[PDB]
């Protein structure tokens with residue numbers, strides 16, 4: 001049982017480089033439009049406190065250099081949608097997959113294709129944190145890298161990377177240009193709200209552990225949904241809804257362990273700790289696998 | 300630090316399905332050859348103790364169903380090299396990347412493109428364990444999935460998945476069909492040897508911690524390589540090779556910490572533990588990041 005990302009080929013064929021003067025980052029080329037963070041129009045000076053409508057009115061199509069590998073794509077139009085710039089180009093991307101733009105909710109996972117200067121570099125799985133950050137692996141030049149899910153050859157794009165916060169976590173937008181979380185696309189120090197643990201995901205991962213043979217944390221105690229949620233809230237865990245209980249149904253059926261019985265196991269782990277033991281080789285309770293992630297990798 | 304895979308697109312374009320009768324698995328289509336585990340020629344009654352030479356003689360080109368998606372690739376020649384079947388097909392794959400076949404050492408990492416029925420499903424990073432297994436994530440139908448590294452647009456293929464062992468770890472071959480480890484391609488219970496910790500990779504992880512400013516474990520001692528190797532084996536750690544010392548060179552240079560001084564720091568951690576302290580936010584020493592992985596990040 002590993003963190004597993006979707007195959008990245010359908011997205012690799014869409015990555016391009018976008019340059020404005022000295023400023024360069026990654027863009028996403030779908031049909032005849034390139035999507036990228038609007039931060040690209042900023043000079044070093046502009047970055048600290050940009051007025052984007054002002055900066056963009058002073059721009060012309062020919063100010064934008066879009067490179068797909070070695071081939072330059074000519075910009076024939078541009079517009080801004082919130083924090084995303086849309087560059088219309090005179091060529092359609094022949095590698096454009098079937099795709100959709102989606103806004104995900106906290107706790108949901110996605111694959112990240114980290115890119116630098118328009119070239120893909122690596123792929124890994126992430127989760128939208130409850131405080132709307134992501135704990136990614138991004139370096140300088142990764143701005144504009146995207147996160148996505150794939151279902152039946154349709155790529156659902158959900159994240160476009162913008163910035164690293166002082167704590168090392170990451171902030172970005174959906175592909176409509178709206179930030180996840182209370183952040184803005186300005187180079188100034190920004191903190192996130194206090195984060196919490198994604199409870200339904202921890203439970204899914206405990207089920208993964210049982211499916212893979214690690215059972216030491218199970219017990220014969222039990223709990224009600226409300227009494228579990230009281231303890232969860234005490235420990236900065238997200239509440240578990242009846243919808244979450246329903247979504248864990250397939251894993252409870254496969255393992256014969258009722259959801260509220262797994263909740264009682266988690267309650268004990270929160271109250272007692274792991275006593276130096278590990279679960280799926282982890283010394284800490286992992287919360288970045290969804291119930292669907294576990295079902296897909298174990299079935 | 301987390302495990303990151305290489306982008307998988309160059310390998311996705313090479314995955315195909317190979318079927319013999321009802322036995323079906325994944326193959327790798329490069330130029331006009333498809334590579335796949337020879338186990339595919341086993342009927343369910345042959346899988347226990349197959350006579351592969353006798354099974355191959357009964358086979359003709361037209362017995363092999365090779366499919367890219369739903370498109371059949373006509374087989375024009377077939378041969379067996381060690382544990383891999385090589386099916387020559389009448390179409391050169393237009394998506395063939397620049398590639399080579401390499402045989403890796405324990406501790407080396409690679410990306411796995413897990414596939415089912417010729418269809419890529421997921422990608423993740425893996426390390427070759429000292430006992431020549433990999434702690435992968437594979438289901439039924441994954442036979443023939445490959446592992447690879449990418450360096451400057453060249454794909455180095457290093458693993459072809461064959462089987463799951465009773466302990467849940469996985470065993471396979473290089474792309475010349477030679478198994479990693481003392482395994483054979485028969486559906487018989489084979490136990491993996493006792494595993495050990497990948498010392499060169501733990502050392503890389505310590506350098507990564509130093510680079511990020513976490514350096515409490517740097518002690519005032521040094522050691523010789525022979526001295527360290529003898530101590531390491533008493534803690535179930537792998538001995539270091541001359542090649543290992545060399546691949547730590549870049550990280551040693553970047554930090555200014557001699558390899559042998561870092562060995563002495565590791566030795567102290569093996570003989571005393573960590574005393575509640577963590578390294579890179581982890582109470583456990585990570586051994587599946589190579590020195591290349593560390594610099595890669």
Ligand SMILES: Cn1cnc(Cn2c(=O)nc(Nc3cc4cn(C)nc4cc3Cl)n(Cc3cc(F)c(F)cc3F)c2=O)n1
Pocket residue numbers: 022023024025037039040138139140141142143161162163164184185186187188
């Ligand atoms: C360490 N790290 C992790 N993720 C990131 C992402 N990231 C980034 O790749 N680039 C940024 N600033 C730029 C500087 C440039 C210098 N040149 C020549 N061109 C540049 C282009 C960019 Cl985008 N930033 C900072 C940043 C990016 C934003 F989109 C934003 F709204 C505010 C910010 F402070 C950055 O975080 N780096």
Ligand SMILES: Cn1cnc(Cn2c(=O)nc(Nc3cc4cn(C)nc4cc3Cl)n(Cc3cc(F)c(F)cc3F)c2=O)n1
Pocket residue numbers: 321322323324336338339437438439440441442460461462463469483484485486487
């Ligand atoms: C749970 N798991 C994790 N990895 C694996 C890999 N694996 C596999 O995918 N298939 C195997 N046997 C087959 C059965 C088939 C049934 N049909 C209809 N077609 C089949 C094709 C195969 Cl390959 N095996 C077992 C196995 C495969 C070998 F290549 C080998 F040499 C020995 C073995 F015991 C398998 O491990 N499953």
